[PDB]
Design a protein around this ligand. Structure first.
Ligand SMILES: O=C(NCCO[C@H]1O[C@H](CO)[C@@H](O)[C@H](O)[C@@H]1O)c1ccc(-c2cc(-c3ccc(C(=O)NCCO[C@H]4O[C@H](CO)[C@@H](O)[C@H](O)[C@@H]4O)cc3)cc(-c3ccc(C(=O)NCCO[C@H]4O[C@H](CO)[C@@H](O)[C@H](O)[C@@H]4O)cc3)c2)cc1
Ligand SMILES: [Ca+2]
Ligand SMILES: [Ca+2]
Ligand SMILES: [Mn+2]
Ligand SMILES: [Mn+2]
Lengths: 237, 237
């Protein structure tokens, strides 16, 4: 299977696979069963912001999710991503729906990776910023149901023309270029990701969520990963 | 055939296809016969810097090549790149040798592209920076004789184990991700590229040069484009 590290915005509690009994943000290392979670006071139909940060000095992956004029949710986990990920990865967003559904709409996405060396004292860097997605976005790999260019947005899961989200949907968008995420001859390796999202459930019973993830370059949507597995994992182990 | 826009650092005077008598920097729009040139006091075996700039406000492509403690060479040409290039491109470096030869060593390369909309009043951007090239650089496409890893450098043309450049060589390195170089909904499109290079000829007779180029995404080395064609053009038209 793929190797996945992900930050989940999990809108539906699957208590049979370790979810707490409330919408939560979580850090996922090679399993949908989050190594750490925090309660998330998710706001139906309002624009949210997710910030993800990692640096190789602290070896700590953290995420903050916020809405205007509300308290943040934050979650952190100590992990050395050198022991978890391959040296080269792709970065992406994933979302899914099941019996229950929501818009998984991305309004903007930015990413920065840096390797600062000293032996050869100069830095390698990648930065991308999408504030507008177009109909034929050739620096994105769209998988499953993901589409671009509807009001300049990335729709990770299927939405009908009148704006109704579909059930049993899964879709992902990966940046085209592979990312050099760690190198054992750097003194500082770091990345940050920001996205703004609009999650709207008409039934106000939302599912299943959005994740930022980092994978092996050749990662694809695993068979049967709709619903609780967020288009990231083949099973619930 | 490919669509090419390029800034050439042309070390060899091919006076039959309109080169001047001396090493020159040139702006190439769909032909090796530069639309504009400037004299370049090229220094055998010293590290140089090239800076390339364009914005859609001035519609002016400019370049400056410099060494420590020396007068720059600069060249500009008015051109509307949205009348020349496709919307989506790749960016790269190219070099060649012919009967005469030189090391075509790249020590660093950075690129920034930005599209500023009025729709969102918000911006799409790509930035990469390589200060070190690794043996397996998965965010580069290498074509022809180009290799990475030797002392952390990119060698666009063939060099022997002791640093002797081979003749009749051609090689290119393209950034993996397509770039969105223009869009008619943007109010400003701009790019900049910077690279440092070490061009060394033991015979003290250098050829043929190095170019920064922008092409169609599926561009490859034209057949027979060693020597004066700099790996960019199928002919001297
Ligand atoms: O326009 C000029 N102007 C003057 C000189 O240029 C300078 O001058 C000033 C000071 O010097 C300075 O102020 C300026 O900077 C200025 O630019 C000019 C025009 C042409 C040439 C030139 C011509 C030729 C050439 C050779 C042979 C023919 C030929 O015989 N054609 C066939 C016959 O055609 C005619 O007759 C038939 C039959 O009747 C008819 O059908 C036809 O229609 C015709 O009428 C034509 C022209 C050649 C050169 C030249 C060639 C080669 C080199 C050179 O250095 N080669 C090295 C080897 O190349 C390989 O290695 C290189 C290095 O690695 C690579 O780059 C290559 O790719 C190869 O691999 C140099 C010059 C010039 C000159 C000036
Ligand atoms: Ca869940
Ligand atoms: Ca030439
Ligand atoms: Mn969960
Ligand atoms: Mn020239």
């Amino acid at each position: 299977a793929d190797t996945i590290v992900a930050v989940e915005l999990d809108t539906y509690p699957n208590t049979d696979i370790g979810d707490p009994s409330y919408p939560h943000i979580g850090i996922d290392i090679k399993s949908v069963r989050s190594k750490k979670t925090a309660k998330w006071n998710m706001q139906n139909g309002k624009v949210g912001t997710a910030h993800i940060i990692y640096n190789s000095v602290d070896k700590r992956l953290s995420a903050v999710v916020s809405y205007p004029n509300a308290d943040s949710a934050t979650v952190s986990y100590d992990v050395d991503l050198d022991n978890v990920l391959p040296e080269w990865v792709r970065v992406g967003l994933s979302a899914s729906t099941g019996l229950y559904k929501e818009t998984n709409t991305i309004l903007s996405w930015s990413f920065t990776s840096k390797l600062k060396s000293n032996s050869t004292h100069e830095t390698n860097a990648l930065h991308f910023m999408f504030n507008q997605f177009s109909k034929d976005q050739k620096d994105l790999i769209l998988q499953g149901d993901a589409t671009t260019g509807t009001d300049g947005n990335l729709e990770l899961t299927r939405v009908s023309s009148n704006g109704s989200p579909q059930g049993s949907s899964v879709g992902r968008a990966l940046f085209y270029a592979p990312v050099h995420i760690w190198e054992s001859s750097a003194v500082v390796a770091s990345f940050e990701a920001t996205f703004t999202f609009l999650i709207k459930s008409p039934d106000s019973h939302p599912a299943d969520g959005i994740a930022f993830f980092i994978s092996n370059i050749d990662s694809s949507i695993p068979s049967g990963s709709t619903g609780r597995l967020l288009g990231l994992f083949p099973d619930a182990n």
